[PDB]
């Protein structure tokens with residue numbers, strides 16, 4: 373900590389407070405995360421994350437494990453997608469910039485997924501943007517290293533809006549498909565300027581998904597009915613049209629979105645396949661206003 377002069381609180385992250393800080397010796401401006409907790413397995417896992425380098429992954433600069441405490445030092449980025457969505461809500465983020473952002477995030481996912489590393493907790497607050505038009509994923513890999521709690525150290529409720537249905541149904545093992553689900557949710561929210569599934573409990577989250585995509589059954593999701601938290605008693609809603617769900621989105625975007633939101637994680641499109649989808653045929657990289 374003392375190697376760093378705290379500039380300001382960015383805010384309270386999943387695992388502890390996050391600060392903009394300056395490296396008092398190198399001049400480097402960084403995001404400093406204190407990890408609220410020791411454990412040798414978290415140490416070796418975090419150490420593996422140091423090598424997982426990609427232009428759309430927030431760079432982990434250093435792990436500081438001193439005085440039985442853990443700090444992570446990241447590349448600093450000045451804005452998150454939530455702030456940027458809020459800032460541009462009168463008109464929406466332009467479609468070419470949505471496409472650029474989705475394309476870059478899928479490249480980041482594809483890279484981490486090829487190394488068997490998952491995010492598990494994608495959300496506008498951990499998608500970070502710069503002035504060169506780049507978008508980057510923050511906190512990749514941390515969930516496996518430390519977990520995902522219900523509440524933060526500060527009692528802020530962790531959001532369920534981007535949680536994949538297999539998680540809500542009590543899947544014990546997560547696949548890369550959970551990140552594709554979240555990213556699809558974020559894609560829809562960029563387009564409509566409304567969260568897709570703003571649940572405020574697990575059942576509310578599940579039943580919001582169900583009311584939009586239809587209650588899943590054995591037809592669309594082989595094995596759904598034997599999942600831990602599946603209840604035969606769930607109401608059986610019918611699916612709605614994507615035309616009604618994400619209106620302005622064109623037929624390519626709707627078609628991609630549909631594949632990122634398949635119930636069965638095995639049927640859900642991979643980041644690699646999604647990058648080849650016709651939706652990206654005219655992708656470009658605009659500069660955002662910021």
Ligand SMILES: NS(=O)(=O)c1ccc(Nc2cc(OC3CCCCC3)nc3ncnn23)cc1
Pocket residue numbers: 382383384385390403430446447448449450451452455456497498500510
């Ligand atoms: N002003 S802002 O748009 O809210 C914003 C958002 C994000 C940052 N930077 C940030 C934030 C961050 O974690 C966030 C997660 C959500 C709670 C606040 C900390 N991790 C990071 N790694 C590199 N930059 N960085 C700075 C400002």
